[model samples]
Target: SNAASMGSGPIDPKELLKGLDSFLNRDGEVKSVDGISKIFSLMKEARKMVSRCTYLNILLQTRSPEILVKFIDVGGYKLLNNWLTYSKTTNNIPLLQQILLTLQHLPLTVDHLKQNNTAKLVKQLSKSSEDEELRKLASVLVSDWMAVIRSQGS
Candidate 1:
């Protein structure tokens, strides 16, 4: 039954991208929905599959940095900033931790290649105008980034 319900073969990445775009751009406003919640739940499961399927990682790596950058551009940074701060005060540290862990998996080399953009992001995040928790997280992440760069060169 599970096999039958699973339907046919693997999902196409193009289709997935299209669907994600549609979801993000719906009504020309950035807002979450019950459906988006479901998609994220599925994405978490798919990430595990990606870990087991090295080819998926290779395919993802082949995508343009611009595409990846678009994610941060499309309100992801602001959403993360809000979450880090609100979640902490709401006693939602588990959710904040999960989000941070997901971010940790982002390749360090990507930041290296886009150092100016990355620095701008960190600088914005570190500003006193930013959320307190985001500032804290940015401080920690910047330290980690420096350490990673040092290690790679060494």
Candidate 2:
């Protein structure tokens, strides 16, 4: 049960993200920071279209506050911000939509949102995205994040 999937071959990004999602779902599973570090490393350099989408899908399923904290500690906010920038730059609406879904659940703080300019990106997306649903989602997330930030005195 230990790193059974950590063998020498090139791991499929889809499988890795899918497996992480499954691990995140388990009831009595002993969570592994090492495994999460590996996954975040995988995400750090993911450039392929399919891989990024898979990464976003798995992130959308993340629920554990512990895992979410690890995500922020591992630069997950910046990773997401970069993805949002790339999505907006390239007019990648589908990718942006998936990113928004992932962003929705993170226990984002003012620093997490402000440091990455993620809030700004979301606000921009809300105003600029022609996709009506995407705009609404972005608007709601930015508004929610801002409310939390303001309540915290920043």
Candidate 3:
């Protein structure tokens, strides 16, 4: 009844990210993270590449706002910002989209956007002729975040 996804059966999502951080800190390959590989495995770093990443997308939609605060505290925002740059360069659309989706869980405060350079990331995507979907997604983030900014400023 806890964290087996909001509408499915599985494991805790927060542990998923935290464990992965430890995995990367050692620079060690992840055969699994918090039993996710035991749950979904079909690729290298299966726990991370497959399970953890997929869970992130789902968690973005299903989890609550409290986690967004927790997520940043857990260093997810940092991981995401760094990884998005890589994903962008590699043309990893799915990953980029998932990252943006994850950020949607955030409060979209100015410090959040500015400190994380969310605006810059959006501009990078939205300025492109080829990055059509990314452009659209970025448009939403910046526009929505700007609305949040504008509302508070008044």
Candidate 4:
């Protein structure tokens, strides 16, 4: 069975990009809660990595804590964890970087990452001597969360 047979609406990459740009550009007081969820759903269902990258890139560009919070509630952490695992397999530096960038915006503590051993993956990345830039980013995220954990212990 081909992977194409998996059930979901056909998601076009360009349409998603166009829709997202306009959706974010509209001047308003944040009325698209379902819109983001639908976009996330389409991203998950879409077979193309390009579609995923486009959506992730746009969302990353926004850097909105409110939007990012909604994303986290709607399974964004799992999405990051999934990509992190995939990137590690192919050693995709760019994807790893993107994931970390998005992760840096998420308001998560170590408790949120306990289930997937996601912190471990991130911790491993922090020690990466191959890429100094990525290593610093990874270390920053790790230490940031570590501080939160320590604060909680107090």
Candidate 5:
């Protein structure tokens, strides 16, 4: 690891993702039981940047919701949702964008907030965000979940 990786400059999502991928294909259909545990381990122990980047990578790269379900079973969503709320004021545009995109992929669940409707949630919350981009991103996030929940059972 270089200085950046050494001191937690920013997590390498790809490399961490490789660790996940490598776990499944030594020649097996099932991913390693330990792999996700190891990844989630990074969430609490490693720097926030590392955990968030690793989380974004999982949301972007993992193709099946089953894996994501396992993720939630082990509390992956809490980590991700934590990043989404707590890091809203951080000074990282790209990281924030990636978080939004990753969040857009996850299934709509309103457990993190008081509102299940998701209507106008971001519009109200993102107003005081650090930048216009985050405000816009927040809008898209709310609408993304809104669209999903709104269209459900059709």
Candidate 6:
């Protein structure tokens, strides 16, 4: 996939945030990160270009869970935990879904760490003042992951 094919040209972080704003401004849409789904397709298309750019890699590395754990000498688990609890919104569901789906694809070599982070995230989300659907999904995801780990362990 290419930037041109992503429904817009390549964008810097500032531009991307601005585009995010425009995307959420659509009528009948919620003004939350949930509305970011409209851009997920674009992101999928632009990922290759994103991977090729040095600045983009820097941006990703800075925020990436794998790198953040090492670079900051602290795990992102707590950060993700906080975000799951504090960043709930009707529109952010898609964004959270995308993130969780992406995490699902990560190599199982990181299973232990990922599971810990995911469990924390689920716990926080379940306690959030957010939509019930979000909490339900989080619980289901956690249960599914726990089943997988248990089966593998056995």
Question: Measured by TM-score, how close is model 2 to the native structure?
Answer: 0.79
Task: Report the candidate with higher lDDT, 2 versus 6.
Answer: 2
TM-score of 1: 0.32
What is the Å distance of residue 16 in model 1 from its true position? 15
Q: lDDT tens digits, residues 9-115, model 4? A: 86566766566654564543224655567667666765566666666676676555677678778887788788877777766677677788877766776667766
Q: State TM-scores per candidate.
A: 0.32, 0.79, 0.60, 0.77, 0.61, 0.36
Ten-residue stretch with the least lDDT total in model 5: 112-121
Per-residue alpha-carbon lDDT of model 2 for 49-144, expressed as tens digits?
Answer: 778887776655555667767776788868888889888988778888888887776777777776677888888988999989889888998889
Say which candidate scores most in lDDT: 2
Query: Compared with the true structure, what per-residue lDDT tens digits does model 1 show for residues 81-136?
Result: 44445444544434444444434443445444244345344544455424567567
lDDT of 6 by residue, 10-117 (tens): 567556544644533344232433333434433433433222132222323233344333311332333333334433543366445434433343333336545446
Clashing pairs in 5: none
The residue-by-residue lDDT of candidate 3 on 20-98, one tens digit each, is 4442213333322333232222212333444546655534543445544545655556666766676677676777777
Native-vs-model 6 lDDT?
0.43
* Backbone Cα, N, C clashes tallied per candidate: 0, 0, 0, 0, 0, 2
Alpha carbon RMSD to native, model 5: 8.0
Please identify model 2 stretches exceeding 4 Å from their true place. 1-31
**Tens-digit lDDT track of model 5 for 47-140:** 6576566557655565555655666667766666666555655656666667666656655465533343233434454565567777788877
lDDT of 4: 0.70
lDDT of each: 0.43, 0.75, 0.57, 0.70, 0.59, 0.43
Model 2 lDDT, full chain set: 0.75
Candidate No. with top TM-score: 2
- Candidate 4, residue 68: Cα displacement in angstroms equals 1.4
After best superposition, candidate 4 residue 109: deviation in angstroms?
Answer: 3.1
Identify the superior model by TM-score, candidate 5 or candidate 6.
5
Q: List all candidate RMSDs to the true structure.
A: 14.4, 4.0, 11.2, 5.5, 8.0, 13.2
